[PDB]
């Protein structure tokens, strides 16, 4: 491994782990297209299992990038259009407030204030219908961004309806398999349980609990190797042999809305490179905690801009993840941890590392 890569990673991550009390961590740096791997600590404290390049971490909301891309793939296949009314794919959604709410709004959290979480009370399909029918927007569609699992979650579920595949089957066949992400899972199979890290929340070992639209919004588990390959696939989508998938990746990094210095993609969020630290450390997306922001429509959406900081933060109760890349520089980072530690700390470390390497 290049000593420059070795030194910046270790010097940045070691104190991060110490200060955040992170039980276990995996990091990939993509430098000139090539992945370099680094691991620390424990996937399972009790059983003394170390973090390896084969350890599975819960990605949490980094799952939304897969959802966005699968969605873009369905657009490329001609199965859906982002301008489609939500009701085209869910005709039972007859409540009036849904008039004017498109798949674009769902995908980009601009539907008019769909809540961050689907309520735990929603435990059936009829429950979910009731929930969406009864939801009252605070804002007109396409006027404000409010980060919401119930928004992109619903986008994910509807985007696959024409295919007739379940969200999981469609994700596996159309994204995971073609990209050879053979250790990326919506549901961790028994064969992989030995590699599945425990997350840690207030000293307890925890895994994400099932919930409505969890797959679509926060339910992917992946290894550092697969995540590096995910970054490579998004850094240079033209190297991909399946056309619709290559096009789907491109669509996911298009710029649909602007708030402040950030542009909303499908799952991915983007800022112009070079970035103000600062404006990302600071920043988004979210406002964590939690931020209704006015959006300016980008009419029409700007195609994927090479000179971008493209990123997504993700958490579950026991895990914290971060992915960032700069297409123009063939440069990226994945940080996977089995503790949910503050977003600004992840962004700072990712910035420290990538700035030094570009
Ligand atoms: C398919 C490939 C192989 O050896 O052909 N492979 C496996 O062996 C399973 C086991 C050995 C490594 C991992 C678990 C997974 C993998 O990539
Ligand atoms: C990943 C995301 C984030 O940090 O950006 N996030 C969470 O903390 C988890 C908790 C579990 C689902 C929801 C709440 C989920 C969420 O939106």
Tokens found for residue 186: 């919506």
Q: From the centroid of its chain, how far is CA 218?
A: 8
Could you list the residues known to form a binding site, using ranges: 61, 117, 147, 149, 315, 340
Residue 33: left (phi > 0), alpha (psi -120 to 50), or beta? left
Residue nearest to atom 11 of ligand 2 (CA): 316
Number of the ligand closest to the Cα of 189: 1
Number of the ligand closest to the Cα of 213: 2
Contact, 7 vs 22, CB < 8 A?
Answer: no
Task: Give the DSSP per-residue string, 140-187.
Answer: -TTSEE---HHHHHHHHHHHTTTTT--HHHHHIIIIITTTT-TT-BSS
* Ranges of H-type helices in the chain: 3-20, 63-76, 103-107, 125-134, 149-159, 167-171, 214-218, 224-235, 243-252, 277-281, 343-357
Report residues whose beta carbon is within 6 angstroms of any ligand 2 atom. 60-61, 117, 149, 218, 313-316
- Here the CATH number for the domain that contains residue 281 is 3.40.710.10
Q: Indicate if the alpha-carbon torsion angle 261, 263, 267, 273 is positive or negative.
A: negative
Residue nearest to atom 4 of ligand 2 (CA): 315
CA 286 to ligand 2: nearest atom: 5
Backbone angles phi, psi at 37, to 5 degrees: -110, 145
Domains held by the chain: number = 1
Cα 284–24–223 angle (5° rounding)?
75
What does the alpha-carbon distance between residue 247 and residue 293 come to, in Å, rounded to a whole number?
A: 29
Could you list the residues known to form a binding site for a beta-lactam, using ranges: 61, 117, 147, 149, 315, 340
Q: Which of 267, 256, 279 is nearest to 311 (CA)?
A: 267
Q: Which mutation among 64, 67, 122, 149 tests ligand 2's pocket best, with the greatest number of atoms within 8 A of CB? A: 149
What does the alpha-carbon distance between residue 341 and residue 20 come to, in Å, rounded to a whole number?
A: 6
CA 214 to ligand 2: nearest atom: 12
Tokens found for residue 260: 């402040």
The 3-state DSSP class for residue 235 equals: helix
Dist. CA 243 → ligand 2 center (Å): 32
What does the alpha-carbon distance between residue 120 and residue 103 come to, in Å, rounded to a whole number?
A: 24
This PDB structure is determined at a resolution in Å of: 2.1
- 254 among known catalytic residues: no
Q: How many helices and strands in the chain, by DSSP H and E?
A: 11, 16
Q: Which residues have CB under 8 Å from 203's CB, separation 6+? A: none
What does the alpha-carbon distance between residue 132 and residue 119 come to, in Å, rounded to a whole number?
A: 11
Q: Which of 171, 219, 238 is nearest to 316 (CA)?
A: 219
Q: Which domain holds residue 58?
A: 1-358
Residue nearest to atom 8 of ligand 2 (CA): 315
Contact, 333 vs 307, CB < 8 A?
Answer: no
């Amino acid at each position: 491994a290049p000593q420059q890569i070795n030194d910046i990673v270790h010097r940045t991550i070691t104190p991060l782990i110490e200060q955040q009390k992170i039980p276990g961590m995996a990091v990939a740096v993509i430098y000139q297209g090539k992945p370099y791997y680094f691991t620390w600590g424990y996937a399972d404290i009790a059983k003394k299992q170390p973090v390896t390049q084969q350890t599975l971490f819960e990605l949490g909301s980094v799952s939304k990038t897969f959802t966005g891309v699968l969605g873009g793939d369905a657009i490329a296949r001609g199965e859906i259009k982002l301008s489609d009314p939500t009701t085209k794919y869910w005709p039972e959604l007859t409540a009036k407030q849904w008039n004017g709410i498109t798949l674009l709004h769902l995908a980009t959290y601009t539907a008019g204030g769909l809540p961050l979480q689907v309520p735990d009370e929603v435990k059936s399909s009829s429950d979910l219908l009731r929930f969406y029918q009864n939801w009252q927007p605070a804002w007109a569609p396409g006027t404000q961004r409010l980060y919401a699992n119930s928004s992109i979650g619903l986008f994910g579920a509807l985007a696959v309806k024409p295919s007739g595949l379940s969200f999981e089957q469609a994700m596996q066949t159309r994204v995971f398999q073609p990209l050879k992400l053979n250790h990326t899972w919506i549901n961790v199979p028994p064969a992989e349980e030995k590699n599945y890290a425990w997350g840690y929340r207030e000293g307890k070992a925890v895994h994400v609990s099932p919930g409505a639209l969890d797959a679509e919004a926060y339910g992917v588990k992946s290894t550092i190797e697969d995540m590096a390959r995910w970054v490579q696939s998004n850094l240079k989508p033209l190297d991909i042999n399946e056309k619709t998938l290559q096009q789907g990746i491109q669509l996911a990094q298009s710029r649909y809305w602007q708030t402040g210095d950030m542009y909303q993609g499908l799952g991915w969020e983007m800022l112009d490179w070079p970035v103000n630290p600062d404006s990302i450390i600071n920043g988004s997306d979210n406002k964590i905690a939690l931020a209704a922001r006015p959006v300016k429509a980008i009419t029409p959406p700007t195609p994927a801009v090479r000179a971008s900081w493209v990123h997504k933060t993700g958490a579950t109760g026991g895990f914290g993840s971060y992915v960032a890349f700069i297409p123009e520089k063939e440069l990226g980072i994945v940080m996977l941890a089995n503790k949910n530690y503050p977003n600004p700390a992840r962004v700072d470390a990712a910035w420290q590392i990538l700035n030094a390497l570009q």
